[PDB]
Structures are given as C-alpha cells and as structure tokens.
C-alpha cells in the first residue's frame, strides 16, 4: 500500500526517504499518482532516463498540464469572461486598480486592460506603480509559459526602464511553479542581475527568485550571491537578493548563501542596519533554515557579534523561522522586535489547532489591551494563522479594529481581512469591504488597502487558494510559507515598504497560489467524470472544495489510487 508511505516521508521532510519510496515500486500508475503528489508539494526529483516511464513522470512533476486542466475547469464553470476592476466595486488608484485586475484574472490568460496594446494602460501609471502594472501581466498569464512569454516579450524591449523591469518580473512570475525544462527565465533574466540601473536589478532578481523558488539551483545561486557584495548594490537590492536566495534555497541549509548573508551583515555600518530593507537579510536567513529547529544554534552563536539593536530582530526572526512548523509549546512561552515575536507565535502555532485557538485568544487580547506598538503586528498574525479561512469571529474582530485611530492597525486589519477571505466569494466579507470602502472614501491609504482586500477576496474568481497546507491539512508547502512570510514581514513596515516604492513585493503571494479544484482521471490521464459527496450533497466533477471539506465518490464502481481525494486523482476500474 505504497501511497501512504510517501505522505509520511514527505512529512518527515527527508529527501532520501522521498526518492527511496518514489522508486522501489512495481507499478507505473502509482508512480504517476506519487508524481502528482510531489508536483503539488513542489518537490522535483531527478530520474535516470532509463526508468520505465521517465517521460511521463517528468512531465507530471513539472506541472506542464496544470494550465490545461485549470482552463478546462474554467470552461466547465463558464467563467472565462474578464472582470474589470469596476465590476468588483490619481496614480494611487490606478495602481490599486491594476492590482485588483491582476488578482481577479489570475490564471486566466485574458484581460480587458492589458489588451493587445497595453501602453494605453501602462502610461496612465507612473514610476513604480507603472512597474507593478507591467508586472501584473505575468500574474494574469500565470502557468501559461509559452503564451505568457509570447505576450510579455513585447515589453522586454521598452525604452522605459520601469516598464522593462516590470516585464522582467512578469517573465519571472509566469515561470513560477512550472519548472519547464528549457529554462526560459534564466536565459531571459540573467543579464540584468548586475545591470547599471538598480530598478533593473530589483526586477531581475525578484523574478529569478520567484521563478526558481522550488529548488536550490547551484547556478542561479552562484549568479545571484555576488550581487549582495557589489558596491553599487543599494540596501534594497541587497535585501531583495537575500530574499531571492532564501526562497531559492528555502529549507536547504545551503552554506554559501548562509556565509554570504553573514558577511553582508558584518560589513554594514551601525547606521545602515537601521534601514528597514535590512530586515530582509535575516528573513532570507530564516527562509534558508525554515523548519530546521535545533540546528539553528550554530547561527545564533555566529550572530552574537552583530549590533545590539539589530541583533534582537535577526535572532528573533531566524528562531521563529527555524521552528515555523514545530508547534513548540516552549518557544511560544518564550515569545509570550515584538512584531516579529507575535508573527513567530502565529507561525509556530498554526501547526496544530489547539495552539491555534490559544493563539487566536492571545491575539484578541493583544488587539484589545496590548502594547500600542505591539498591536500593530497582531492583525498580520491573524492573517497568517487563518489565510483563506473565512472565520466569522476573526472577520468580526478585524472589522471592529478596521477603524482604529492608529493608521497602521487599520491598514494591517484591512489587509488581514483581504487575506483571510482570499480566494472565496464570501458575500458577508464583500459587503463589509464595500461598506468600509464607503467609510474610508477620501482616505487614500485606507482606500488602497480596501481595494487590495476586495481584489484578494475574488482572487481567481473563487478558484484559487493561498493556504499553505494541502492533502488533508497534513503537508506544508515551504514555498507558500516563504511567500507569505515575505509579504507579512514587508507589511511590518507597510507605510514605507508597501505604501512607498516597493509594493511590487506583493507579487510574492504568487508563490503560494494553488488550485482548490478536484479532478479525476482514468489510468490514461483522461478526464473521467464521476459523482461525489462533498461533506465536512452531490455534484458532477470537476468540483471546487473549500478549506475544510472532504469529498467522497458515491459509488463503488471506481477505486482511487490515493486515499486522499485532493487535487488530481487517478481512478481504477472495479
């Protein structure tokens, strides 16, 4: 009974076990099922070309067919029509609309703004807002590598540097989660990582980080690591480079990135480590050690030389990253600088439900009576612990604290409502956002957060999720966690990172985007309609599961190869 073993092994996070059990099998269709599981988990394992069905197992692992099945389900629902931003309802509102359009139309390669000629929209934006506008094209064309690049290529030759940087970022985005074997992204992006213009460096490096977040490629890391030591690199470029390297090397314990990050910290003046882009350096370090637990002491000891104010931040962030999956009661006691502390409480507690409910009570207490500075991060922790999970109590709390006189609590509460409801058409939440949009009219920043939350609620027109867990809520996608942490750590300085120049980091959410649709196949990977009983009623598949539902097929005619009816399942005959 092979399929269970590979689940348990993937939980153990051990490469050797994964490859040991993914072979040592006398069936092929079971290997195809395990390949679908690995593809969902974002693990790609290299196989010898002499294995019995190398071509198809490789084709499955690289999610090449994901786009076609997703568009097939989009044809079943009859939802291919584009939704302009005004249907959901200054430069800052053009940018807000661009983001709404990108979120809503994600994974359908259609749009009414970025038409055949997108200059008409791009030149209504300016500077970084125009960069993120150009970057949104790659979010609309997600997982469509061939058509994505065919559409993006026109902007790669623009005279405007912001548009070219956004096209580079789009080219990176369209390569996320697909791992095609021709390497279009390394060939297209790698010439700009040391470009003279820093905006080009930011776009190329973030694109490469998103395109290769799955695997710790040695060539991409050797390309990128020099850029943190370049004397022309801004602190923003060094931070983005550390983010990219930690995403690419996430959970790998790669020593050369670790040493490079420590060297880049040790070089920086006590005056520069005050720059808030410096917070991305230990974030990349934690991503490099995410979930490795007690092994982190060696680096905690190496960090002892760092300046005292920065030391608290680096140590806390790296420690809570190392234990992100642990669900350790004692580290939670230690955490019970402060913002990263509460984010680490959520990051650790999300691994089990009793700890998560105690965390929810703690976060409510902190929002009501906590330190005035400490409560600023609490809504982001509430977002992290309950992404794509529209709990009524959480949404009520955030709606209460959505008017708070302290602007950052309001901003973070609104963003947390948008995240919690992401990928769900919840009508209560949509009405809340519409009312808060009427209240926060004539308030550009709160209105911007409201528009972001509105767009995020309708992400994919209801067909996408951001939850990091999958397969019966028992396996954690490290790339999803890395993207979510990138965004929320950037939101611990929302007024200067997100509302400033660097809102392009919101596109890190693409690393966590996944489909929430069930699909059944015959042993030939051919769409096989069956009837299912989705509980916690009947429908004709492919059907959409919500956060906590279990789907069962209501006849004994077919038997599934995997015990878990999540994602893609191959079905045998009697």
């Amino acid at each position: 009974r092979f399929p269970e073993a590979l689940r348990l092994a993937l939980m153990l996070n051990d490469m050797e076990l994964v490859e040991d059990i993914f072979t040592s099998c006398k069936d092929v269709v079971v290997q195809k099922q395990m390949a679908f599981m690995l593809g969902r988990h974002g693990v790609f394992l290299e196989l010898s070309e002499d294995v019995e069905e190398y071509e198809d197992l490789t084709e499955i692992m690289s999610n090449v067919q994901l786009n076609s099945n997703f568009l097939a389900l989009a044809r079943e629902l009859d939802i291919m029509e584009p939704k302009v931003p005004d249907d959901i309802y200054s430069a800052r509102m053009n940018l807000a609309s661009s983001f709404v359009n990108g979120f809503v139309n994600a994974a359908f390669g259609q749009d009414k703004l970025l038409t055949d000629d997108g200059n008409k929209w791009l030149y209504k934006n300016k500077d970084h807002g125009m960069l993120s506008a150009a970057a949104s094209l790659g979010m609309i064309l997600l997982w469509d590598v061939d058509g994505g690049l065919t559409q993006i290529d026109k902007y790669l030759y623009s005279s405007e540097d912001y548009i070219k940087s956004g096209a580079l970022l789009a080219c990176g985005i369209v390569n996320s989660g697909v791992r095609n074997e021709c390497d279009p992204a390394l060939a297209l992006l790698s010439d700009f990582v040391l470009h003279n213009s820093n905006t080009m460096r930011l776009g190329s490096i973030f694109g490469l980080g998103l395109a290769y977040a799955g695997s710790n490629r040695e060539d991409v890391l050797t390309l990128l690591l020099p850029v943190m030591g370049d004397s022309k690199s801004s602190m923003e470029v060094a931070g983005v480079t550390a983010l990219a390297c930690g995403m690419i090397a996430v959970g790998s314990c790669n020593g050369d990135v670790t040493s490079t990050i420590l060297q880049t910290i040790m070089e920086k003046s006590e005056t520069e480590l005050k720059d808030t882009y410096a917070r991305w350096l230990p974030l990349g370090l934690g991503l490099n050690h995410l979930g490795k637990g007690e092994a982190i002491e060696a680096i905690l000891a190496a960090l002892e030389v760092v300046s005292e104010p920065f030391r608290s931040f680096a140590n806390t962030l790296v420690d809570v990253c190392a234990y992100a999956g642990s669900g350790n009661v004692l580290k939670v006691q230690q955490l019970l600088h402060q913002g990263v502390a509460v984010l680490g409480i959520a990051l650790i507690a999300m691994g089990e439900e009793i700890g998560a409910e105690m965390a929810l009570r703690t976060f409510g207490h902190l929002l009501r009576y906590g330190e005035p500075t400490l409560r600023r991060a609490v809504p982001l922790a509430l977002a992290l612990i309950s992404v794509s999970n529209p709990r009524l109590n959480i949404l009520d709390t955030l709606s209460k604290f959505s008017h708070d006189a302290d602007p950052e609590v309001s901003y973070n509460s609104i963003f947390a409502m948008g995240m919690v409801g992401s990928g769900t058409n919840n009508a209560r939440l949509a009405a809340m956002l519409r009312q808060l949009a009427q209240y926060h009219a004539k308030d550009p920043n709160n209105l911007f957060m409201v528009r972001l939350a509105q767009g995020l609620t309708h992400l994919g027109k209801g067909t996408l999720t951001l939850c990091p867990y999958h397969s019966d809520r028992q396996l954690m996608s490290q790339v999803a966690v890395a993207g979510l942490l990138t965004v929320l750590v950037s939101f611990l300085d929302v007024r200067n990172i997100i509302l400033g120049k660097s809102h392009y980091v919101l596109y890190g959410l693409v690393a966590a985007m996944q489909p929430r649709m069930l699909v059944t196949f015959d042993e030939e990977l051919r769409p096989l309609p069956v009837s299912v009983r989705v509980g916690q009623q009947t429908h004709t598949t492919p059907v959409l599961l919500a956060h906590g539902e279990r789907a069962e097929l209501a006849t004994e005619e077919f038997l599934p190869v995997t015990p878990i009816l999540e994602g893609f399942v191959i079905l045998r005959k009697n």
């Binding site: 929002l367 009501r368 009576y369 009520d396 209460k400 008017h403 302290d406």
Partner: peptide, 21 residues
Amino acid sequence: SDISQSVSSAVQQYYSYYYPV
C-alpha cells in the same frame, strides 16, 4: 467602534482601551 455591535463579556462597556468608554 462607536458603540450595538458586540462586547465579549466586557460589561458600562470596556471592550478595549482604544475605544470610547
């Protein structure tokens, strides 16, 4: 907010320190 609405057994209401008493 203004406060109607809900108070989690905080009853005068003293829902939080950042709301009018």
